[PDB]
Amino acid sequence: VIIDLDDILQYQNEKFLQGTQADDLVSAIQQNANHFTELFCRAIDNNMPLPTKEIDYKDDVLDVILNQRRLRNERMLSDRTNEIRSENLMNDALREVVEDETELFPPNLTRRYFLYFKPLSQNCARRYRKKAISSKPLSVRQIKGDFLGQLITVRGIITRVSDVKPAVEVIAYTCDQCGYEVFQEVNSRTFTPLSECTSEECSQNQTKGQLFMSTRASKFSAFQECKIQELSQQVPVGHIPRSLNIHVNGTLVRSLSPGDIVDVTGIFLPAPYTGFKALKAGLLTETYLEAQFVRQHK
Amino acid sequence: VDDVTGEKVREAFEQFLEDFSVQSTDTGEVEKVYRAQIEFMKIYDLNTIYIDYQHLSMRENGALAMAISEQYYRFLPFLQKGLRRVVRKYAPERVFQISFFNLPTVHRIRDIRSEKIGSLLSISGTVTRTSEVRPELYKASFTCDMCRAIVDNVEQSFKYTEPTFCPNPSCENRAFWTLNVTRSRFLDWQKVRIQENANEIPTGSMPRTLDVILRGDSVERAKPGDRCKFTGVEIVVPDVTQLGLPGVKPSSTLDTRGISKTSLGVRDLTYKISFLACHVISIG
Amino acid sequence: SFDRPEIYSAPVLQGESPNDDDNTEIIKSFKNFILEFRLDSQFIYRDQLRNNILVKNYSLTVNMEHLIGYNEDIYKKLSDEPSDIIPLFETAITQVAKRISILSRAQSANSLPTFQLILNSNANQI
Amino acid sequence: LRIIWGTNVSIQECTTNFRNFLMSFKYKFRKILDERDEELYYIKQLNEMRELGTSNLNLDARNLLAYKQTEDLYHQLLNYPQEVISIMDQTIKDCMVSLIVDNNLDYDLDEIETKFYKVRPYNVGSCKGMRELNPNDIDKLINLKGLVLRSTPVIPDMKVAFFKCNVCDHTMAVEIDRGVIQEPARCERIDCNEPNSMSLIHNRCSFADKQVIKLQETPDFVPDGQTPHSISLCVYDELVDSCRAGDRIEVTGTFRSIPIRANSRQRVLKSLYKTYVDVVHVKKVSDKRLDVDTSTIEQELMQNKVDHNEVEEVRQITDQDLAKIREVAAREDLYSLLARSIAPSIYELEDVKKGILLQLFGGTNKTFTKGGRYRGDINILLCGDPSTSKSQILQYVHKITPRGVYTSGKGSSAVGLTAYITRDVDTKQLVLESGALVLSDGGVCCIDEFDKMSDSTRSVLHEVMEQQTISIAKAGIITTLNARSSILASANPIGSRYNPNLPVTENIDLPPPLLSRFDLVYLVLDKVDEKNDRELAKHLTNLYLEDKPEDDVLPVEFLTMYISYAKEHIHPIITEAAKTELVRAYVGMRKMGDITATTRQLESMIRLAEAHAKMKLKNVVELEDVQEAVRLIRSAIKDYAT
């Protein structure tokens, strides 16, 4: 899913000229830019032409799993509304009682798509000057440590590209006694397997279960990274060029050959890491960049 | 059943050697070779035996020969204990080692599988990098500060597990202490690592190595740069470094669905094929 | 810097469930009691608690001698080890009561503590 | 409808549709081939399973394609391989019982039923390479190719555990689960009287067998900027020593990804799982396209592998083409037809291509009762001017050889051909690797720009050309070993054109006793004529014009099996009648004196003569066919006038 900034700015031109007032949204995204990922994407799942094609038998092994979790959600939803109307003492509250008495799959777990942002060109910014600060050919030397969380634009040379290998995100866990599925989200570098069970039904009982993970039910992600060397043209007269780490996730993988000239735009986030143990001054933040869009010269 | 069967193995083997030994006439040896085996050992007192596999293949028509040759690891104490009663019947400190020879079938390192453990298979090769003489304990005298600190006891096997749970001291099962380093019976051993023959190696393949320990009498019989034949027996040593091998790793997470409650001291295992022997002839 | 990890699940496969008459099994039995007892022309404890919320009683009255007429195993099981089965009752009380609080407010016009049972009898004045 | 949670299949719809295919085949795969014996395969193919008692049936992928039914069944195997195979094995085992009710006195009906049966499906597509594979494609069937580096030792794995206690020693046991082995608290007297401490003895328990093999692949249609890459795999019980190191094996398997521990201490598993191969069926057997390996090398495992039912490893010769082999054997012009049919790109060197042909019919492996060991190798250097496409010859030679090694100059060292001892990664040890000639052990090695070797490189060649051994005696291994090959190399002279009025021995930078050590040496030079040059551009444009490979019969695959059949069934004998002429011929060769002729040249002719007798199915020698064996040497000699 590709989102520009120009149709936003075109809409933001459009609303002021025809209606009273629009909240500013270009510079709103431009500041923090990380909370705008999922808070935007859950609004997408409100409206959807869902049954628009009968499923293909050879479509996707991912597709048959999400179709279950869509259906298993609704069949479990259809059960609880039967018992409550059968035990009475407008139906919105009757709907609302069903909402909180049943454990469900989260809507973050069945997505199947991805969303990448896109920076605005100066071209429409040339017509109406607005917050066009995100798109300038900036240097790694120009990266001061005050631009954290912003949306930026850098360029350089792709150097020492790694290999693409899957990154585990969430792990499924089969109970085998209570019959639930436990889910553990990991955002750290390493993690641990967890205890024997954490069900609500295995709980408050003497004999808890003993679990194990599963492969086909977990969600993975395409992962590969590389380093960008300085452009060697704006370097000061006696300096040596540095490098910078950029993580790449999802669709945009397998798109960057080494030794090129490319415009990389993204958002600037730290990673929890410090160097040697004795050299730690107490809060040492090691940074990186997350890739969002590739525009290659040549 | 199995208490009876290995004891039936014990008694039939006790029946076997106590019978006639060699069929041959006065032209040659007449009788009682295994009976002369102890009586000649009584002259020298070296406390071991040289018994044939071929004479054991004669009497029971291979029914008993195909009883021992599969699970010898099952049959350690039964072969030793009955022979001990054969000695005290005929003879008067006594410690024993059982040696075999004349194996009809000899294989190589490539003909070894995990289904061959406990069984007897003869392997020849190339001896390289002998090592020194070092002892082995197998007789722990280890009990707590409670009065009965005299437990001549377990860890005869391949485990450093000295204290038994149920003594009748004031000490409990959790009570454990060091071994008495002066009152035990030891034996020594060396550790050579044999290389495979060059007359059997296939294409594209280097010769292979394997560790083997000779305990007690069979020390110093080894020679680097020699061809030898071995005891058929085989053991397995626990390994460490086979991590991230990759593979589905076995574990020892014990049951918790037993005793009712109101942390996780579990372990894993990853071993390696080793080899053990007691008779080494050096033909070749 | 990240935030804390989270753990959630949901039971899907209804497997490995023998009727062992235990921790979760006993709790479901009393939902079959309060909503689903009815004596002659009247059900009482369901109509008792529907007043008690507007009263803000947060409590309940038990004829224990009535309970042997309903079921048989519960009465002797509570008789041996009551101290374990007493707190599990309160969960069966409130899960019914959580539904009724929604049925009260949303039909015709949050904070909900743990209730308390009161039992009485006149069998053996020991 | 009944359903399994992860899948979209059922037991009965899969089973009854599978029974449908097992009673219906009428060469439907040939209907796509358009036909250019019509009974179905699996009736007969289950019978050779039946009367022989041999297990492990196997099949391709395309048999589910041409059959109109079970087309839906085919993609089910692609997406859920673990469950689809097992359901087939039940009804195949039931299909065994469906045959046994016909004769009803068959093979002690219970126990042949009791034996485990399984299927090894293979040939399951070849779409894209390893690098392309997204993280979505976790468990699919993957066909890959390439070469084999090394072989780990046997890794055991417990399948049934073993437990005891101390008081009266009850000895119950338990098996491996999908992840662990669990154990109770109290055991003696059932679960009662809390008797004793639980024991575990790990030499009375059952096990399994596993082997790790690290592989390097050749992913044809490479991507851009692509480096070579190495992967590994995890063969099991029956496939133990089903592979050697250096073979060109196609590999059918399933992709996996499993976490790894950190620093052997804690339970914190690292993220970003390490991926590997979980193989299904092996193409260890020879391809029909390329050449077949000798039987003088495999004969250790031909002496083995009868004990366990395994793969065949040998290109099987059918029946109808045997007379067709005997049809081509009756051809008069075989001695001229065959060399022309080898390389249709270059129209020349008909004696030299014949030596390439006679390189493949090479010699009789004569070993004595003690000693002997006289191989069938012949070793040729060819040289001359560039723009000869000498490399294009060798690449075509490199494709045929089942264990071909193509080297070059100045990228080598003395250590660079043997004893590649280095550090291991995942087990983190010091592991010794086989070298280049051990990768050349059996087959043809290829060397370019031979004049620019060192002294130490090319000194290794003395041992192989004379003794056919390699002596390793440094810190890893002190033990000699043999590595037989067909050595062939090429170089270019000092002048880009060899000028006349100058000795041929002068203009090549070899020591001439080492130069004369070779079996036969060629020189290819340019001629100033005109007649073949009109034949030149008409031939070479025709290969380029009308973009299609098109008065000669060129059997592509007859010679492939013709050489392989002639390899084992022929041991040419060199009896008395040739010895009169041969000794008569050698002294007149020795008579030239004042390049030289040595005792290598005496051994040279007898290994080339019976090689020609290995052509055209002659187990004996004849006094004629010896003259052109001289003339092949004289083909060099009449080029040496100047």
Helices and strands counted in chain B (H then E): 5, 13
Question: Across the interface, which of B247, B255, B272 has its CB nearest the CB of D184?
Answer: B255
The answer to whether the CB of B99 falls within 8 A of the CB of B231 is yes
CA distance B107 to B200: 11
Q: Look at the block and give the residue holding tokens 């048989």.
A: C72
CA distance D153 to D585: 54
Q: Look at the block and give the residue holding tokens 């102890």.
A: B38
C20-49: burial string, b at 16+ Cβ within 10 Å, e else? eeebbebbeebeebbbeeeeeeeeebbeeb
CA distance D451 to D437: 19
Residue in C with minimal Cα distance to A184: C7
Q: Roughly how many angstroms between the first and final C-alpha of chain C, as a whole number?
A: 66
CA distance D359 to D519: 11
CA distance A223 to A252: 10
Greatest CA separation for chain D: 107
Interface test mutation site (partner B, options A175, A196, A197, A205, max chain B beta carbons within 10 A):
A196
Residue D333 CA from chain centroid, whole number: 32
* DSSP string for residues in D573-642: B--THHHHHHHHHHHHHHH-------HHHHHHHHHHHHHHHHTTT-SB--STTSHHHHHHHHHHHTT---
Alpha helices in A46-116 (DSSP H): 63-85, 92-99
CA distance D185 to B128: 46
Strand residue runs (E) in D452-605: 470-472, 479-481, 486-491, 520-524
- Strand pairing of D380-384 and D520-524? parallel
- Strand pairing of B209-215 and B275-277? parallel
B110 contact residues in D (CB cutoff 8 A): 241, 304
Q: Do D157 and B247 touch (CB under 8 A)?
A: yes
CA distance D238 to C108: 74
Q: Look at the block and give the residue holding tokens 């799942």.
A: A45
Name the DSSP class of D546: G
Nearest-10 crossing angle of helices C23-34, C82-107:
50
* DSSP string for residues in D405-421: EE--SSS--SGGGS---
For B127, the enclosing helix (H) or strand (E) is strand B126-128
User: Which residues, other chains included, contact D634 with Cβ-Cβ below 8 Å and sequence gap of 6+?
Assistant: none
3-state secondary structure of D216: strand
CA distance D220 to A211: 43
Breaks in chain A (C–N > 2.5 Å) following residue: 89
In degrees and rounded to multiples of 5, residue A96 shows phi and psi of -70, -30
B206 contact residues in D (CB cutoff 8 A): 432, 434, 438, 477, 481
Q: Do C9 and A180 touch (CB under 8 A)?
A: yes
Breaks in chain B (C–N > 2.5 Å) following residue: 92, 262
Do A and D have ≥3 inter-chain CB pairs under 8 A?
yes
Q: Is D604 annotated as a binding residue?
A: no
Our CA angle for B213, B219, B224, nearest 5°, is: 80
Q: Does A182 touch chain C (CB under 8 A)?
A: yes
Q: Which amino acid, A265?
A: T
Q: Give me the domains of chain B, ranges plus CATH numbers.
A: 1-105 (3.30.1640.10), 106-134+188-239+270-284 (2.40.50.140), 135-187 (no CATH)
Q: Is D108 annotated as a binding residue?
A: no
Q: Do D271 and A191 touch (CB under 8 A)?
A: yes
The answer to whether the CB of B48 falls within 8 A of the CB of B61 is no
A258 contact residues in D (CB cutoff 8 A): 225
Helices and strands counted in chain D (H then E): 20, 21
CA distance B210 to D11: 48
Burial class (CB in 10 A: 0-12, 13-18, 19+), A110: middle
CA distance A249 to D219: 25
User: Which residues, other chains included, contact C13 with Cβ-Cβ below 8 Å and sequence gap of 6+?
Assistant: A179, D5
CA distance D604 to D633: 10
In degrees and rounded to multiples of 5, residue D29 shows phi and psi of -65, -30
Name the DSSP class of D263: T
Interface test mutation site (partner A, options B249, B254, B257, max chain A beta carbons within 10 A):
B257
Q: Do A210 and B260 touch (CB under 8 A)?
A: no
Q: Is D391 annotated as a binding residue?
A: yes
Q: Look at the block and give the residue holding tokens 């730690």.
A: A280
Write down the experimental method used for this entry.
cryo-EM
Q: Is D476 annotated as a binding residue?
A: no
